[PDB]
Ligand binder design. Sequence first.
Ligand SMILES: Nc1ncnc2c1ncn2[C@@H]1O[C@H](COP(=O)(O)OP(=O)(O)O)[C@@H](O)[C@H]1O
Ligand SMILES: Nc1ncnc2c1ncn2[C@@H]1O[C@H](COP(=O)(O)OP(=O)(O)O)[C@@H](O)[C@H]1O
Ligand SMILES: Nc1ncnc2c1ncn2[C@@H]1O[C@H](COP(=O)(O)OP(=O)(O)O)[C@@H](O)[C@H]1O
Ligand SMILES: [Mg+2]
Ligand SMILES: [Mg+2]
Ligand SMILES: [Zn+2]
Lengths: 596, 619, 587, 49
Amino acid sequence: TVVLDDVELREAQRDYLDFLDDEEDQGIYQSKVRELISDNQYRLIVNVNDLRRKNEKRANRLLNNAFEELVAFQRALKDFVASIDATYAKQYEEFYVGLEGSFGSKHVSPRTLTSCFLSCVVCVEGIVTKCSLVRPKVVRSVHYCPATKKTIERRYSDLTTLVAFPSSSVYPTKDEENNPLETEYGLSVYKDHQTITIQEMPEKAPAGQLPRSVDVILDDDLVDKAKPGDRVQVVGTYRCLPGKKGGYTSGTFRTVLIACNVKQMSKDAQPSFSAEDIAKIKKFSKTRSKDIFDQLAKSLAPSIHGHDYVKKAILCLLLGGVERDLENGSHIRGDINILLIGDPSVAKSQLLRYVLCTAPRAIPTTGRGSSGVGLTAAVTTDQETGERRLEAGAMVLADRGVVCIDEFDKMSDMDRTAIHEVMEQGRVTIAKAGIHARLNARCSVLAAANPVYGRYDQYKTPMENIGLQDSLLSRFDLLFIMLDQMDPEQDREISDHVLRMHRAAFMKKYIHVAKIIKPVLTQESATYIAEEYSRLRSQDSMSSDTARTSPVTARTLETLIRLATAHAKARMSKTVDLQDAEEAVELVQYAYFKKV
Amino acid sequence: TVVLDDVELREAQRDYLDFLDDEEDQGIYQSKVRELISDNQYRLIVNVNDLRRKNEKRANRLLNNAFEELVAFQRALKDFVASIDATYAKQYEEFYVGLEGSFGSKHVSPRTLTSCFLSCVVCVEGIVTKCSLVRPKVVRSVHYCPATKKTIERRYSDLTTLVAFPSSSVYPTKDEENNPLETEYGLSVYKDHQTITIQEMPEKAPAGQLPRSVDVILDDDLVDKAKPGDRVQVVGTYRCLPGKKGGYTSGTFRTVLIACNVKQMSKDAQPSFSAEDIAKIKKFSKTRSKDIFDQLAKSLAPSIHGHDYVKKAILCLLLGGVERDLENGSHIRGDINILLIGDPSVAKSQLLRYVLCTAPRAIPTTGRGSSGVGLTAAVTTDQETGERRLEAGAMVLADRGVVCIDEFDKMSDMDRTAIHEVMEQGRVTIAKAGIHARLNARCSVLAAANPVYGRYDQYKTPMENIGLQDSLLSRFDLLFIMLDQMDPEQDREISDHVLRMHRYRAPGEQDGDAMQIYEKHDNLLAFMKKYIHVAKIIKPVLTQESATYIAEEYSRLRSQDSMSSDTARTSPVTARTLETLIRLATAHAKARMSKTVDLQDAEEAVELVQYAYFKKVLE
Amino acid sequence: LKDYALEKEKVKKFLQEFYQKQFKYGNQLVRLAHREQVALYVDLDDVAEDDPELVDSICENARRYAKLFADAVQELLPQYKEREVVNKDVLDVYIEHRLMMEQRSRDPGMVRSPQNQYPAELMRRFELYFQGPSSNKPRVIREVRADSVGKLVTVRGIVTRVSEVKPKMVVATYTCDQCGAETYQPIQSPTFMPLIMCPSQECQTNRSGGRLYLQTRGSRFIKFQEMKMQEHSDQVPVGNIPRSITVLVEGENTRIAQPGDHVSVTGIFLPILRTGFRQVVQGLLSETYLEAHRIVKMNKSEEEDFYEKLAASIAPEIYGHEDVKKALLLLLVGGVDQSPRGMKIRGNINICLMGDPGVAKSQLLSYIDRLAPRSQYTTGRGSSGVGLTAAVLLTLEGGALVLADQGVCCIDEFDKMAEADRTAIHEVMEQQTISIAKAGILTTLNARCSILAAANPAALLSRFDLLWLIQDRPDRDNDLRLAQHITYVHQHSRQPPSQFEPLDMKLMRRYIAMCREKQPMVPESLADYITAAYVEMRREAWAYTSARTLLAILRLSTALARLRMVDVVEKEDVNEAIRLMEMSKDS
Amino acid sequence: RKCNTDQAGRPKCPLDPYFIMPDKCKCVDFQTLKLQELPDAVPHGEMPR
DNA sequence: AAAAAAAAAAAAAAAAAAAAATTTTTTTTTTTTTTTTTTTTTTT
DNA sequence: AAAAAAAAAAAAAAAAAAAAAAATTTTTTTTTTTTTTTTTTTTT
Ligand SMILES: Nc1ncnc2c1ncn2[C@@H]1O[C@H](COP(=O)(O)OP(=O)(O)O)[C@@H](O)[C@H]1O
Ligand SMILES: Nc1ncnc2c1ncn2[C@@H]1O[C@H](COP(=O)(O)OP(=O)(O)O)[C@@H](O)[C@H]1O
Ligand SMILES: Nc1ncnc2c1ncn2[C@@H]1O[C@H](COP(=O)(O)OP(=O)(O)O)[C@@H](O)[C@H]1O
Ligand SMILES: [Mg+2]
Ligand SMILES: [Mg+2]
Ligand SMILES: [Zn+2]
């Protein structure tokens, strides 16, 4: 049979084509359809808030009835992109829609998702837990008869959550006169297929409760969108799977979520670019360049008083240096690592949490919160296919980002021996019997530690005040000392500022573009750094009662280069000048020399 | 499971697209396409000899395996007629391909339709036997759900020959929500369907053997092209049928012949002309219009001598008068009817066999061969529905045709009176308790009676010597008396003619073993059919002069003085004789292609009756 | 594929807004609401007067629009309803009671299932049919084929058979043995299965049986008739037998057609599924009937000297026989049927034309057959045996005489008929009945027909009322006159213009019916004169006659009074009757 | 185990014709809890029901 | 050096899935047979 | 020429052949979820 008339379907496609047109009203979806055409994509994404704004009743129909309205939507998109382009619409055979925006009662978690939302469009929060091996499902299978020289093509359809009989899912193996066929794999069509398992986000679940999880199904251009441990938010259709041919049914209908869209946490917001953003950042770059770093570091973490040099170093780690890779295969890392250490109540954890709130891909961890295998990667067994499997630790997740360690001194020594890999290479050489690997874990480490004896002993050398060895302090590019100086004006200003704060976005834009920027250094700066490091590498550099803090090394020179390049990234000059070199010299001097 | 490409189908469709492409050739099939598009007919008839000469291998392939081959042919036909006119090609979901030509080994008869010819387009002559009710068959059925304001179109595939599944045969009645669906009969689409039964002709069949017949399924386009009793040549696909589902089968496969086309095997509806032949007839008329009746009359029935008046009269019959149906349906007939009465061995039966071989839709009736219910129509019940059907008789078959009555004298009085209303009004009003009807048989009758005593006695009057009532001899409009004078002189005449015809041979075609307007004037001695066929249609109205003259001559004939004593009337002069005068005048004018009956034709008619009727009994 | 709600509003617009200014359909709607009218006939010419494309849609899709028109008029009745119906019929009482109780327990806000409703045809008490558009051409039964299925064809043909009005179920009604709620089962198929269990909400909730019983009392029936119509002879092709269509009649269309008449049916061609058969071809075939929406009877089944004027207008083709024409006109008009104590006397003339060949006996006979309102024609052995009488098919269906009952039977070659047919004809002449006592039949059929006979030369003289010798004998002047007449006929396809044009057959049948409905009396004054005339002819015949002769004179006198159109039998009437009898004698 | 929808003159639907349309059902939640005897209510020597 | 956390491997149980499966009876159709009417044919 | 007798025709009823029509859940398997035990690796 074929439907000739359908008021619902016809009006659905009419309303959709009207909505997706949008050229006369602000061109939102005209721009989006042109964008996916030019970018060669066929899964549009549609703001349900705008759909409600235009045709609210259509929106309610869409939400409360998913499969019918979505089929109507995707076919209307097919016709619309057919109008705007011909060969493209012919090339791509079916144009999907995904949904997005605010889904008031339907924006749920795997706990609150009851059967009330069956056949409806839900928006489920929560982490990912499983990610199946991606597999092609056959959708248009071509065969060639060797004897007859004729080619056929059986077809299939997405009978995922509808009635399915054996006739649809037969696959040819014989010709009509018993002349066995040969399948043409390349001429056929295929659709990758993955299945993940969302779980209620571990914090948001009520305490002492075994968590609730919901299965999710993924198809073309959605398979490798979320690995395990992703803070995903899946918008999709919640439905029932038919238990195949029965003769006795308990009535227990298993359920899934056919995902019509997949998103990560919004923090990784590299695309947020616009005319106002470029205008203001160009103003900032051009009208002032001799105090970009000073002003930015000053306004970095306004809540905490002082810490001028330490905050400047935080900004140095945040921007980073420049990863210098060599033709031979050598790689000299571009990322600074910092160890705050100081008296209690000197905002060490607050600087850490500041980085965690602001930076992209910033991972918290506390001293004995993660023990080894958590911090670096680990190797588990699949336990179904027998093979090994790699479980990415905090550092691996934090690759090209930052890890903030709190209670670093109270972190076990074994963990620090583990991060001996990462603190210079950015790579973890995990290995067990069945799998060897070399995982890119290239990420900065900010750390906080309290000194031995609970509080910093003012009248002892830093090597005696720190419970860490020359090796570890060398792996850290920067070590910083903070002491509560109890001077009267100091106490006055710190308490005044604290009470004042008891009574940004441009920075977020600036940081990642500056990270993108890759300056190069001048010969003036090169000679200057060579002779400055030579000055430092000398007993004459230090003096009695002013002991060094960390064992000065070629690492110290290299991290001075990273600091200078970082200041160049701040200045947007693409030229590490003597200004940057001098500033890095001042920073390393203050960080590396402390009195006794 | 849509096929991407098949070399066989692609090749066959290309070959037949070439075959239809007729411009570099004379344009025959292109002209056929254009005329059928103009007609709105949707079957094109392709000659198998044409197909064989252009590609013998495709002819072999098609005559060995029809249905898919003809699917290729018909798809090519649809593409071709779309190129000529896409708008018309869109009109019909399918177009069809009839056949014609020399089906040499593929010409058998239903006795000889063995199991070797399956899926092969067989050619078969035979007589119909049944005519099932032409009833619709649904092909594309539309439905409307009023609860959901929905419409559906279930689709059906004509699997009359292949395997058919219930999933294909479902007629929907409820939606997915168990709502009621109302059929949309008008919006649906149907094709007629009729079964018939061809039979081996008894003239062809073995003498002592039971009949053998084959079933024929005429779908649309071939609804009423075959009634019972007709001679028909059927060309089409003998196949097998599917037994309905069931876990058991005997091997039996009752078989049919899904006819690809059926044509009238009589081969007597033959107006086949050319423009040159039309011009030939036109000049033949106009150049010598005044002598043309005598030209035709002398021409007609060669291989017989004299009887020139009878040849003129049989021309008046065959050319026919003109039927008249006045304002209120008072139908005055326009056929001649001739009674040959004469001695034996006067070629009366030979004239009858001549008109049998020549006149289209001529049929023989013997004295006690055919009888009444056979002669005229009949009413009989069905026994499959208890309903009264009508069985058309010999005369009704011969409606607008000729019947040759051999030995008219021997038909008993019951049938001799049963022929009365067909003789005058050309209808048979039959009726029994269920059904009644007025079957129409506008027939013409050439009847060869023989005299009482086995030979005419010259001295006895014709009324004494004819064993037929004045009642009937009124209805007959001409009675021609054929005596064997037995004189040696006319015997020399007839004898030389007869033995010349015994000496005439097939010219050149034979060696010694036994079995154009004008003719090449063979010393020992077609267009007749052409000219008389065109002649039949003209309605030459009577002129005032002809009507007054024919009226006065009839009054003279009625008056007794017009016959001298010693002559005896052969048929009493009722008003039927006047109408005879008018009809013979019209037939002569039709011979002339006059467009008006003039005094020439009137005086010829009066000459005809004066010779025919009044006989000189001698003492 | 059109919005049927939109079209429903359009048909409402047409029904409400049509006028001609009297609001034809508005008044019919008022009559409907009052129940003074059980069937409404829509006129597609009137539809096309404003919306021809609507007529196009109807014709291409009829039964759908029958349903839509019916529903629209149902919806529109309360708008025009003025006063309460008088509850004429038990059906009307039932619909009133059902409306009462549903309005009682309605719960107006509440929503109910689609099946908890009265079937839409159960409450109508009005039929709706279409009168086909004049723009459509009347088809022929061979030409009406599968491409006309579901379409409003217009066809013409002779009705050859019709069953008697039987009641047909349209909505079966049932009553539970538990819940006291009626149940309704509509009907579409020719046959049906009756329900067993009750779908009432109470029965299902209590989980009791509720094995409902069928009630013939609370159900709806409609009158149902079926007729077998067939082609006229004239429109058959050359070699064929005429073809038949099975027309189905129901409602107020029944009891119109009777076996023999000529009809024109506007009807929806439809199929019927074929079940209980084992054919060859797969798929779905269908016996096709014709739902009849409008039956009409067409053609023969619809001035001091008026006698001579009408008499000379019978069969103007045939020349002369003017007094035979006068006598034939009397046979058509008839005399009077008086009702005395114990006896009944037929009032029908019988005429026999005994004649020489070629005097157009059959032409006169056929003209009478086609002219007469209810007529039949037999020619020799065409209709013998049970062709004149009735035979059983079971059902008893009439032959020529029974068809010509209350009419005219025209028999040709009277002398040559079979002995049995002659005997039956004699009984019909004597008593206007046929008493059959054959094997399958025992019956006394009522065959009231004037008999017109033709033949060529004692029983005839004794039986018949008038017997006319028409013998040709040659004559110069008169054969010239006949020749001039017939040759003018053959030239102009028309009679030669007399002083007055012959009157048309339609007006002829009209005047014959008007004269037939004008039964006059024989006075008391004229008894003396008519007795005198009768006794006089007895003297002359003594120097064949009998009481039949007096009855013939009386019937002819009454017929003459009928034709004269006023007053009672008179001197001039008896004079002309005796003149006709005396000219039969002179024949 | 029988398709009731009978169509005349046609072979019948197969023996076990029915498949559970998942799109068109009404479904409600359900939770299978485990309850245990109140520990005070348990007798001295006895495992909780 | 002892404790313990994790890993892999092994086993039990509940839910879903898999698999197995001709025979008897009824109805149309065809074909003859028999009765009774009609028709035709032979006799006085 | 009409009556009597016989033959054939028409129509209803019956007997067999062969193709259609109808009825028609229960037991076993086995994957998946869960728990349990012995061991090695790691931490106190
Ligand atoms: N320089 C500072 N200015 C303002 N507040 C400070 C400063 N140093 C410490 N604090 C306050 O101390 C509190 C806790 O300090 P925290 O970050 O826990 O240090 P630690 O990790 O040494 O305990 C915070 O509420 C923070 O505001
Ligand atoms: N007029 C004639 N001209 C020539 N030959 C004739 C003529 N009449 C009779 N014959 C011959 O006499 C034979 C008579 O045959 P046919 O006509 O069958 O018998 P009948 O004449 O008794 O009907 C014919 O074969 C024919 O050859
Ligand atoms: N008086 C007349 N006027 C016109 N036509 C006549 C007359 N008499 C006879 N005819 C013609 O004679 C023809 C034969 O008459 P017909 O109907 O056979 O009489 P019947 O049936 O008694 O022999 C008819 O076509 C008729 O028109
Ligand atoms: Mg702290
Ligand atoms: Mg007659
Ligand atoms: Zn009930």
